[PDB]
Write a structure and sequence with these properties.
- The PDB classes it as hydrolase/transport protein.
- The structure is cut from a larger assembly and holds chains A and B.
- Chain A is mainly α.
- Chain A contains ten helices and four strands, in the order βααβαβαβαααααα.
- Chain B has one domain.
- Chain B is 48% helix and 6% strand.
- Chain B has three helices and two strands.
- Chain B has helices at 18-33, 44-56, 61-64, and strands at 2-3, 6-7.
- Chain B is elongated and about 75 Å long.
- Classes of the chains: A mainly alpha, B mainly alpha.
- Chain A binds chain B through residues 139, 142-143, 145-148, 150-151, and chain B through 37, 39-40, 43, 46-47, 49-51.
């Protein structure tokens, strides 16, 4: 950043940072605090996190893996982390099980930056829209089990078909994932993505089966796979 | 039915007839020969009984408290 370039920084485990810092304080004789963590946990995380910013000359952006012990966000480790994040991408063990491997929950993933005048209206609108539709499906899901699919109005069973599609669409084959799946990974732009989700819910691509959206770049590829079908 | 100082029309709620009736009867017989689901109208009871089912489920509540039964 001193050289004036926009570098990224991936800390592998913010948890093992604080936890390792716990051992130090321990055998160093300090009095434990919250859950036995070091009595300085706040300041340790403070300095590590604070030098990571965008200076007048350059910038250092960071994406860091925050492990949650017992899936408890009250534990001090991920707790003191939250205050510093500009955006939070929650992944899900259950989403992954069902086959979607960019395994993120669109409903709980957030960004202190996802407002209209920051990221443009088109982005904020289609963003909230995907959120909205994913939600409505969740509500519909209840009546669909109890009294079946035949109960949904034509408009509803249209929302569910359209939602089902966007679910798979926002999964995609990573490039570093080929050692696992074998399929070719694919990079997608921000404008292809928006152009994709906006349409798929407005919604042009109603004539093609879900599987077309399963693992693809922009819908341009989805429509192709849809022909092979 | 017309009678001394009164006339009532006892209307059918749907077109009746031996042909249409045997159709409804055969249907009723068939639905019984094959246990098969069918949605009752109530949605208020639907999504509520579902939430109730999920909320009740997997609570160790009766174990956590000390209760006799």
């Amino acid at each position: 950043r001193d050289e004036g370039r926009d570098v990224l920084l991936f800390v592998d485990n913010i948890y093992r940072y604080t936890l390792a810092g716990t051992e130090v304080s321990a055998l160093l004789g300090r009095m434990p605090s919250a859950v036995g963590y070091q009595p300085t946990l706040a300041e340790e995380m403070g300095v590590l996190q604070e030098r990571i910013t965008s200076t007048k000359t350059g910038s250092i952006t960071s994406v860091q893996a925050v492990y949650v012990p017992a899936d408890d966000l009250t534990d001090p480790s991920p707790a003191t982390t939250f205050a510093h994040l500009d955006a939070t991408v929650v992944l899900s063990r259950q989403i992954a099980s069902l086959g979607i491997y960019p395994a993120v929950d669109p409903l709980d993933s957030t960004s202190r930056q996802l407002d209209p005048l920051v990221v443009g209206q088109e982005h904020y609108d289609t963003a909230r829209g995907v959120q909205s539709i994913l939600q409505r499906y969740q509500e519909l899901k209840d009546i669909i089990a109890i009294l079946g699919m035949d109960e949904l109005s034509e408009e509803d069973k249209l929302v569910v078909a359209r939602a089902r599609k966007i679910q798979r669409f926002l999964s995609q084959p990573f490039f570093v994932a080929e050692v696992f799946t074998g399929s070719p990974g694919k990079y997608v732009s921000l404008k292809d993505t928006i152009r994709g989700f906006k349409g798929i819910m407005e919604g042009e691509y109603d004539h093609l089966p879900e599987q077309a959206f399963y693992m693809v770049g922009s819908i341009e590829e989805a429509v192709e796979k849809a022909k092979k079908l | 039915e017309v009678q001394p100082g009164n006339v009532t029309v006892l209307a059918d709620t749907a077109i009746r007839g031996q042909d249409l009736d045997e159709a409804r009867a055969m249907e009723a017989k068939r639905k019984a020969e094959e246990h098969i689901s069918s949605s009752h109208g109530d949605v208020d009871y639907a999504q509520a009984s579902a939430e109730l089912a999920k909320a009740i489920a997997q609570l160790r509540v009766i174990e956590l408290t000390k209760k006799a039964m």
